[PDB]
Amino acid sequence: HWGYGKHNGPEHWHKDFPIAKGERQSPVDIDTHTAKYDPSLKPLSVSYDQATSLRILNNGHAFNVEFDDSQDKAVLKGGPLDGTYRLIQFHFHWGSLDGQGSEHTVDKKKYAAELHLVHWNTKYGDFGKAVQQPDGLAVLGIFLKVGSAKPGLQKVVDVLDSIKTKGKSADFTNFDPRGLLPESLDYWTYPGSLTTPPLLECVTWIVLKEPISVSSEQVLKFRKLNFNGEGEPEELMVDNWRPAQPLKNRQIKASFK
Ligand SMILES: [Zn+2]
C-alpha cells in the first residue's frame, strides 16, 4: 500500500487519495514574512494535567503514543480553536540526516524531526466523526533540532527497542506529554489536512515557533526503528515525512509579532 519509498511515496498518493491535490493540504512552508499577526487570537491553552497515556505502537509508518480520550483529561483550547479538543495520540516524523525530517518548513528550513500532538473536537462524539469535519482536528506541531538531550523524550526513546517492527506495541502508562513542550507557546496557524493518507482536510494546524532540542543519540534511536514487520526484510524507518504542499488560497496567521 502507501509508504515513503520511491514506488509508494507522497508522489503516488494522489492515485488512491485524489484529495492529495486538494484545496487545503499539509504540510506547507511557513514564510515568516508573509504570516499575519492576528491580535484576535486568544491565548493557547494546553491542559495536559490529567493526561493518561496507554500504549506505544509501531504502525509501519511511525510510532504512536496513545492516550485515554474518553474524558477531558488532556485538552487543547484557545488560540484559533473554538471548543474543546482532546489529546488522542502523538507521533513524530524524522529524517535519515539531521538536515531533514520535519514536515512543515520555516522559510524553507527543514528540521531534524517534527512532533505531532493530535487532538479531536469533542463536539463530534468520536475521532472517526471528527476527521470528517473541516474543524474536526487540531494538531500541535513541534520542531525538533539536534542539540542537547530532552529529558521528557528519553522515556519514549528507552522503549523503542520493544516496538522495533510494524505491529509491535508496548505498555506506556503514566507518560507526561508536558515534558515535550518548549518554553514558549508562540505559534503559526492555518487550515490544513492530515499529512498521511487519507489526507483528510479536517485539521487546524498549530505549529510552534520555538523548537525543542534532542540529542543525536536520541534521534539515532528513532532511526533504528523498522517500517517492516518482524521476520520481513529490514527497512529502516527514516524519512517518514511528506514534503511541503502549495499554500494555494490560504493564509498563515501568527500569534506573535
Ligand atoms: Zn504527523
PDB file of N, CA and C in Angstrom, residues 21-25 28 34 189-192 201 245-253:
ATOM      1  N   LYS A  21      -4.230  16.359  -3.916  1.00  0.00           N
ATOM      2  CA  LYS A  21      -4.028  17.579  -4.696  1.00  0.00           C
ATOM      3  C   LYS A  21      -5.135  18.570  -4.366  1.00  0.00           C
ATOM      4  N   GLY A  22      -5.712  18.417  -3.176  1.00  0.00           N
ATOM      5  CA  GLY A  22      -6.807  19.269  -2.738  1.00  0.00           C
ATOM      6  C   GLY A  22      -6.548  20.738  -2.465  1.00  0.00           C
ATOM      7  N   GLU A  23      -7.573  21.394  -1.924  1.00  0.00           N
ATOM      8  CA  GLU A  23      -7.561  22.823  -1.608  1.00  0.00           C
ATOM      9  C   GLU A  23      -6.834  23.243  -0.319  1.00  0.00           C
ATOM     10  N   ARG A  24      -6.743  22.347   0.663  1.00  0.00           N
ATOM     11  CA  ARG A  24      -6.077  22.679   1.925  1.00  0.00           C
ATOM     12  C   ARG A  24      -5.210  21.536   2.461  1.00  0.00           C
ATOM     13  N   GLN A  25      -4.188  21.172   1.697  1.00  0.00           N
ATOM     14  CA  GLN A  25      -3.290  20.085   2.064  1.00  0.00           C
ATOM     15  C   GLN A  25      -2.109  20.508   2.921  1.00  0.00           C
ATOM     16  N   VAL A  28       2.969  22.550   4.745  1.00  0.00           N
ATOM     17  CA  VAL A  28       3.241  23.699   3.885  1.00  0.00           C
ATOM     18  C   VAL A  28       4.482  24.405   4.408  1.00  0.00           C
ATOM     19  N   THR A  34       5.357  36.501   5.529  1.00  0.00           N
ATOM     20  CA  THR A  34       4.067  36.547   4.858  1.00  0.00           C
ATOM     21  C   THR A  34       2.968  36.231   5.871  1.00  0.00           C
ATOM     22  N   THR A 189      -0.619  29.436  12.623  1.00  0.00           N
ATOM     23  CA  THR A 189      -1.771  28.564  12.451  1.00  0.00           C
ATOM     24  C   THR A 189      -2.427  28.717  11.077  1.00  0.00           C
ATOM     25  N   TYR A 190      -2.924  27.611  10.541  1.00  0.00           N
ATOM     26  CA  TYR A 190      -3.580  27.627   9.246  1.00  0.00           C
ATOM     27  C   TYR A 190      -4.445  26.381   9.119  1.00  0.00           C
ATOM     28  N   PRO A 191      -5.416  26.403   8.198  1.00  0.00           N
ATOM     29  CA  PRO A 191      -6.306  25.259   7.983  1.00  0.00           C
ATOM     30  C   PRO A 191      -5.659  24.282   7.006  1.00  0.00           C
ATOM     31  N   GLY A 192      -5.620  23.006   7.378  1.00  0.00           N
ATOM     32  CA  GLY A 192      -4.987  22.021   6.525  1.00  0.00           C
ATOM     33  C   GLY A 192      -5.528  20.609   6.623  1.00  0.00           C
ATOM     34  N   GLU A 201      -8.914  16.774   4.908  1.00  0.00           N
ATOM     35  CA  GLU A 201      -8.743  18.186   5.202  1.00  0.00           C
ATOM     36  C   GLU A 201      -9.643  18.578   6.368  1.00  0.00           C
ATOM     37  N   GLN A 245       3.442  21.273   0.671  1.00  0.00           N
ATOM     38  CA  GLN A 245       2.458  21.365  -0.397  1.00  0.00           C
ATOM     39  C   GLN A 245       2.132  22.829  -0.645  1.00  0.00           C
ATOM     40  N   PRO A 246       1.628  23.162  -1.846  1.00  0.00           N
ATOM     41  CA  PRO A 246       1.280  24.547  -2.183  1.00  0.00           C
ATOM     42  C   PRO A 246       0.266  25.149  -1.210  1.00  0.00           C
ATOM     43  N   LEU A 247       0.523  26.375  -0.766  1.00  0.00           N
ATOM     44  CA  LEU A 247      -0.379  27.039   0.165  1.00  0.00           C
ATOM     45  C   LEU A 247      -1.728  27.358  -0.484  1.00  0.00           C
ATOM     46  N   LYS A 248      -1.700  27.626  -1.785  1.00  0.00           N
ATOM     47  CA  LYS A 248      -2.900  27.960  -2.541  1.00  0.00           C
ATOM     48  C   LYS A 248      -3.688  29.113  -1.927  1.00  0.00           C
ATOM     49  N   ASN A 249      -4.996  28.943  -1.784  1.00  0.00           N
ATOM     50  CA  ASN A 249      -5.825  30.010  -1.236  1.00  0.00           C
ATOM     51  C   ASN A 249      -5.934  30.009   0.288  1.00  0.00           C
ATOM     52  N   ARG A 250      -4.790  30.024   0.967  1.00  0.00           N
ATOM     53  CA  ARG A 250      -4.765  30.018   2.427  1.00  0.00           C
ATOM     54  C   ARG A 250      -3.860  31.088   3.017  1.00  0.00           C
ATOM     55  N   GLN A 251      -4.148  31.450   4.258  1.00  0.00           N
ATOM     56  CA  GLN A 251      -3.387  32.462   4.970  1.00  0.00           C
ATOM     57  C   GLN A 251      -2.879  31.888   6.282  1.00  0.00           C
ATOM     58  N   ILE A 252      -1.603  32.117   6.560  1.00  0.00           N
ATOM     59  CA  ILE A 252      -0.987  31.648   7.791  1.00  0.00           C
ATOM     60  C   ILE A 252      -0.979  32.794   8.791  1.00  0.00           C
ATOM     61  N   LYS A 253      -1.599  32.587   9.946  1.00  0.00           N
ATOM     62  CA  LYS A 253      -1.636  33.623  10.973  1.00  0.00           C
ATOM     63  C   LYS A 253      -0.612  33.309  12.055  1.00  0.00           C
TER      64      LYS A 253
END
